[PDB]
Symmetry: C2
Subunit: 948 residues, 2 copies
């Protein structure tokens, strides 16, 4: 079995050099791959394994020299597979790619930071290898900017970093498989301890193989397209994985860094430097599976998970808190609590003596935590309870008060060190996670609210709120919000949709405010949308109404946004309701779908500038909420510079960002990855408040305005004006298959009969990610740079000045370059040849030329000859993934030709050893061609991760 | 029970059916599920107080000061309207809270329990219409 000698060779040819001296990535991937291939052989035979390995080697040769002969060879092998073998090959390559991502996480997580590799400017902040840690950022603020430590500490206490978890656009991988990935990562890591004993190393190898096989032998389909509650349970995995333990660890490190510049205090235990919000179960925009009851369910589930974790943690806290000397106040509380009926620690003590007052108070808190979980579970499972609300924690102050009493008391007695142990970690967890871990945002289209108001105004014979001009809408909305009469009752003709909207508001009213974040209006355009939501909130008896957040998606919505926000602040009722705080949401991907990526990036910079102008004019604290697709939505290092790049004063101590589902594993799956994530968010926020990026030279603005015009013209002329483009998009791309299959819970279009305008941005991105073409990300850049270069020979120099000195531009280009690295036009060509009509082939050809031209231009702009010349670590990891992804592409393409064309008979090969073909019985397509397709989609999706 | 009675009569057991069974049916019919049906009774002035607190809370004037014809006209426009009248955001005296809460209790109990709402010191159609409106707007 000298088979290993082959994969090593291929791997080392894929990543030739070393990206450092602790570069063990090729080693890691070889080890994992060898163990996996042996498992494949032991379960499905020597022939199956030899086939799979020949496929991998061919793919690696392709990602090396990009000879199309290699694609012809891969295809030749893959078409001759009957559905059984096709499923096993696709599954095989999905799992192999997963293992590659695992070795990547280990390598990243243990790479030694090179203090000599820092250049000294902001470019260092674009990679984890040279970015500033917390303390380095403190020293940067103090030295270069001559800020006093007191100013840094004060800035930090009032800072909030709000991470919003959203559902994954495809396979939000099951919590079980995450657990397995963890065990594999740990086995890998421990195998490379430079001090390990032979028997230890043996048992670790056997454990690694054992877990690789375990993960391979779990189905990844069947059952249901998981219900929204299931998707939410899966999203909450990272709290148990890393985040719960990770928050107090990060905060304590902040304490140390503050000590290391002379600050004697710690960050206050109730200060919300970290917050977590969730859309899982709250975003109903174009997702009818998300019902009112779904929202009630995920709210209660969250309250359960939080109470559970607090329950388990408070027992170790009770064991720690064995002191006797205490404050007079706490002694009073102990004697008071000692007057009662001790069920949840009979294994520990028959009862708790008054000589352990801390243990008394804490034991009572433990009792209240148990009753909160039991009552939430009864509310979820029935609808009523019998657990009195007076015996649980209903708001966060009830919970914090006894703990703060213990802390104060301990400090009174000079036991501050004891107080700063498990107790401090507990207080910080209560403050960060509250009673729910996450706060659920609600999201709905503006049109649904307009429908509701129109049904009401029709029911009152006042006219159609829909037909009303925006000024008439505003005037009516204002008179009603200021009025004393309720608006509607049960006697109201409600369509199924209008009933959905109102019932959602009623659910919101019947749940604790600690559970909710923001109500977000998709497709916001005018103040009447926000006012409409505010009115529906009031007239549905939502006692503590949510903050309303407009999501300005389209380009015209962005230009009109600051006018709208000004008009909203200028209204007396709204101005007093917001209490000096406004949060606006921007969607990088939505605006991209509208008007191309370059024009949307620049328009979003300008729109944030104007919104901060309005917020200062009227004295409101503006908070920008960054939706998916952004520069700040990337994974790892790049996030640091992306945040630093935001226009001055757009953050101001409140960062709200979407943690994309395709990135959450790379950012929170591992202990170090999580810590460094929280760190770069906190450090980037803190620094940007005090050290904004340079303001752009006026010529830079004028240039970007012109480029945006040309770029929008090209993007729209292709996507929207070319009549046959929609024909091409349906052939060269599996967009239709994505809409039909059990990959995401959402419909891909808002109106089934519409063109690209009615297509949601996620299937738009996804469709072109699968073919490694990435049109939605780069289309429009080519003609823009081409235009400015021809318009004046010297504009190229200006662009290069921007990339080297203007952060926003550098990060935008950098993102484009990263996406091009995940691109391969040759594969897009394979899809054309197999799936697209002949008279449409030149169309694709022209598109690919644009692809190529743009790439060259981006390179010229970035001053690079190769893609990602400045980040060889990422270039390496990407190349390693690409070798697996390419096979999944070819398999996807031929599987598509096989599905769409039953008149494409192929010379099948004999089946390859023991089955997986009988796990999808009720399939209308072939015995396992639907499953093969789903596998390649989940796989390519996992390999390409994030683009735009 | 009517099924038992019908069935017995079908089999020529009408005499048996006209015994304890007939007595039972008659007791069900006479006493219903409650034995008695409770009438509610309240002064007209208490209803006038409630309406006046509402009209004051809507800045339309004092329902009390209104002539009987103006009272009637407003009551009519409201009873025929599609918009509810008041909410929790309403300054309720202890008495007005008593009246509204009584209507809420009536709404949350089976109709078999109630007879008639009786207005002591009735004088004009606006008293009856007032009670009808409070009944509707208290669901
Ligand atoms: Cl005992």
């Amino acid at each position: 079995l000298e088979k290993m000698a082959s994969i090593d060779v291929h791997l080392r040819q894929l990543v030739p050099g070393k990206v450092s001296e602790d570069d063990k990535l090729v080693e890691y991937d070889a080890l994992l791959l060898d163990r996996f291939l042996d498992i494949l052989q032991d379960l499905h035979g020597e022939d199956l394994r030899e086939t799979v390995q020949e496929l991998y080697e061919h793919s690696a040769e392709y990602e090396g020299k990009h000879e199309p002969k290699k694609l012809e060879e891969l295809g030749s092998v893959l078409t001759s597979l009957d559905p059984g073998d096709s499923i096993v090959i696709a599954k095989a390559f999905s799992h192999m790619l997963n293992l590659a991502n695992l070795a990547e996480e280990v390598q990243i997580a243990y790479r030694r930071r090179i203090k000599k590799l820092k250049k000294g400017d902001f470019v260092d902040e674009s990679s984890a290898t040279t970015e500033s840690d917390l303390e380095e950022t403190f020293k940067k603020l103090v030295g270069d900017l001559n800020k006093s430590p007191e100013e840094i500490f004060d800035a930090l206490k009032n800072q909030t970093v709000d991470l919003v978890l959203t559902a994954h656009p495809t396979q939000s991988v099951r919590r079980s498989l995450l657990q397995k990935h963890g065990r594999i990562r740990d086995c890998l890591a421990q195998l490379y301890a430079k001090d390990i004993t032979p028997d230890d190393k043996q048992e670790l190898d056997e454990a690694l193989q054992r877990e690789i096989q375990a993960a391979f032998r779990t189905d990844e389909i069947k059952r249901t397209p998981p219900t929204p509650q299931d998707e939410m349970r899966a999203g909450m995995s990272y709290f148990h994985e890393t985040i719960w333990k990770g928050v107090p660890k990060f905060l304590r490190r902040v304490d140390t860094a503050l000590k290391n510049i002379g600050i004697e205090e710690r960050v206050p235990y109730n200060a919300p430097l970290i917050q977590f919000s969730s859309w899982m179960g709250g975003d109903r925009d174009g997702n009818p599976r998300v019902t009112p009851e779904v929202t009630r369910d995920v709210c209660l589930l969250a309250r359960m998970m939080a109470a559970t974790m607090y329950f388990n943690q408070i027992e170790d806290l009770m064991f720690e808190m064995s002191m006797w000397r205490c404050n007079d106040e706490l002694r009073a509380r102990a004697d008071e609590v000692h007057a009662n009926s001790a069920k949840h620690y009979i294994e520990f003590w028959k009862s708790i003596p008054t000589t352990e007052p801390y243990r008394v108070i804490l034991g009572d808190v433990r009792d209240k935590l148990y009753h909160t979980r039991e009552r939430a579970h009864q509310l979820l499972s029935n609808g009523h309870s019998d657990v009195p609300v007076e015996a649980t924690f209903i708001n966060l102050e009830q919970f914090l008060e006894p703990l703060e009493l213990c802390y104060r008391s301990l400090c009174s007695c000079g036991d501050r060190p004891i107080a700063d142990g498990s107790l401090l970690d507990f207080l910080r967890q209560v403050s960060t996670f509250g009673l729910s871990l996450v706060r659920l945002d609600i999201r709905q289209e503006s049109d649904r609210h307009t429908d509701v108001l129109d049904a009401i105004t029709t029911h009152l014979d006042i006219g159609s709120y829909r037909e009303w001009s925006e000024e008439r809408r505003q005037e009516w909305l204002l008179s009603e919000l200021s009025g004393k009469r309720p608006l509607f009752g049960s006697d109201l003709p409600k369509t199924e949709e209008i009933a959905d909207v109102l019932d959602t508001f009623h659910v919101i009213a019947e749940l604790p405010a600690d559970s909710f974040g923001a109500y977000i209006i998709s497709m916001a355009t005018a103040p009447s949308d926000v006012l409409a939501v505010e009115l529906l909130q009031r007239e549905c008896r939502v006692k503590q109404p949510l903050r309303v957040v407009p999501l300005f998606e389209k380009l015209a919505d962005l230009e009109a946004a600051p006018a709208a926000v000004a008009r909203l602040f200028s209204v007396d009722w709204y101005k007093n309701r917001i209490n000096g705080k406004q949060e606006v949401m921007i969607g990088y991907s939505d605006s991209g779908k509208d008007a191309g990526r370059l024009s949307a990036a620049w328009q979003l910079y300008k729109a944030q500038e104007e919104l901060v102008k309005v917020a200062k004019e009227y004295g409101v604290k503006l908070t920008m909420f960054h939706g998916r697709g952004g520069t700040v939505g990337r994974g790892g290092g790049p996030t640091h510079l992306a945040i630093l790049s935001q226009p001055p004063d757009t953050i101001n101590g409140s960062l709200r960002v979407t943690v994309q589902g395709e990135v959450i594993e790379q950012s929170f799956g591992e202990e170090h990855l999580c810590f460094r994530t929280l760190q770069r968010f906190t450090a980037a926020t803190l620094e940007h408040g005090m050290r904004p990026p340079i303001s752009p030279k006026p010529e830079w603005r004028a240039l970007l305005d012109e480029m945006a015009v040309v770029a929008t013209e090209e993007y729209r002329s292709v996507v929207f004006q070319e009549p046959r483009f929609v024909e091409y998009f349906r052939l060269a791309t599996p967009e239709l298959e994505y809409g039909r299959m059990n990959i995401g819970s959402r419909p891909s279009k808002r109106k089934p009969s519409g063109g690209i305008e009615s297509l949601r941005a996620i299937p738009w991105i996804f469709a072109w990610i699968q073919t490694r073409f990435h049109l939605p990300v780069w289309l429009g850049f080519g003609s823009a740079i081409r235009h400015v270069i021809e318009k004046d020979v010297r504009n190229l120099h200006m662009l290069q000045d921007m990339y080297q000195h203007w952060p926003f531009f550098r990060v935008t280009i950098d993102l484009i370059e990263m996406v091009f690295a995940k691109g391969d036009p040759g594969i897009a060509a394979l899809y054309d040849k197999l799936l697209v009509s002949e008279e449409l082939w030149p169309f694709g050809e022209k598109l690919r030329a644009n692809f190529e031209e743009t790439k060259k231009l981006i390179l010229q702009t970035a001053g690079h000859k190769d893609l990602l010349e400045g980040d060889p670590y990422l270039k390496q990891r990407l190349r390693l993934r690409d070798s697996y992804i390419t096979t999944l592409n070819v398999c996807q393409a031929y599987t598509l030709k096989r599905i769409r064309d039953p008149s494409y008979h192929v010379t099948l090969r004999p089946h390859i050893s023991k089955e997986l073909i009988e796990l999808n019985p009720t399939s209308e397509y072939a015995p396992g061609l639907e499953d093969t397709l789903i596998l390649t989609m989940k796989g390519i999706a996992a390999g390409l991760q994030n683009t735009g």
